[PDB]
Amino acid sequence: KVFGRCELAAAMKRHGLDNYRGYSLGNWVCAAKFESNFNTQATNRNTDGSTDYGILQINSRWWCNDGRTPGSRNLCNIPCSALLSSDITASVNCAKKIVSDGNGMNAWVAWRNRCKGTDVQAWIRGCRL
Ligand SMILES: [Cl-]
Ligand SMILES: [Cl-]
Ligand SMILES: [Cl-]
Ligand SMILES: [Cl-]
Ligand SMILES: [Cl-]
Ligand SMILES: [Cl-]
Ligand code: NA
């Protein structure tokens, strides 16, 4: 599924991400835009051999099991393929764990490089929330 901007903001808001650990909704929407272009099916390989999965590009190095990332962890206790559903629940619940771990949203490289310190409210402008 490729979410619309306001469609995803609303889904994210329903799932409790608005101001989760102090990150406004616009941060999460911005992160998803640059991580996946709002595409729940997005997958990208990392140089180390891990893979990033889904709308928030959750990494098999630490967070999910894909059976082909030697040495990795599965801290969200989920198969990586479950993070590719058109329902964003699994991705959001794992994202809550990631963002609580110490680094906040700096865990998402795209957030840090493209969203952090910018006018993130623009991403929810005009949306019924
Ligand atoms: Cl915002
Ligand atoms: Cl593995
Ligand atoms: Cl959903
Ligand atoms: Cl889900
Ligand atoms: Cl923080
Ligand atoms: Cl607004
Ligand atoms: Na893993």
Curated annotation (Swiss-Prot):
GO molecular function list: beta-N-acetylglucosaminidase activity; identical protein binding; lysozyme activity
Enzyme Commission number(s) from the entry: 3.2.1.17
Active site residues of this protein: 35, 52
Principal place of residence: secreted
A GO CC annotation given for this chain: extracellular space
Subcellular location, record wording: Secreted
Cysteines joined through disulfide linkages: 6-127, 30-115, 64-80, 76-94
Reactions listed under catalytic activity: Hydrolysis of (1->4)-beta-linkages between N-acetylmuramic acid and N-acetyl-D-glucosamine residues in a peptidoglycan and between N-acetyl-D-glucosamine residues in chitodextrins
Entry-linked PROSITE patterns: GLYCOSYL_HYDROL_F22_1 (PS00128), GLYCOSYL_HYDROL_F22_2 (PS51348)
Residues the entry annotates as binding substrate: 101
Residue stretches making up the C-type lysozyme domain: 1-129
GO biological process, one term: defense response to Gram-positive bacterium
Alphabetical list of SUPFAM superfamilies matching this protein: Lysozyme-like (SSF53955)
Tissues in which the UniProt entry reports expression: In the egg white and polymorphonuclear leukocytes.
InterPro entries referenced in this protein's UniProt entry, alphabetically: Glyco_hydro_22, Glyco_hydro_22_CS, Glyco_hydro_22_lys, Lysozyme-like_dom_sf
Its job: Lysozymes have primarily a bacteriolytic function; those in tissues and body fluids are associated with the monocyte-macrophage system and enhance the activity of immunoagents. Has bacteriolytic activity against M.luteus.
More info: Lysozyme C is capable of both hydrolysis and transglycosylation; it also shows a slight esterase activity. It acts rapidly on both peptide-substituted and unsubstituted peptidoglycan, and slowly on chitin oligosaccharides.
Family: Belongs to the glycosyl hydrolase 22 family.
Assembly and oligomerization: Monomer.
Protein's name in the database: Lysozyme C
Organism of derivation: Gallus gallus
Gene from which this protein is expressed: LYZ
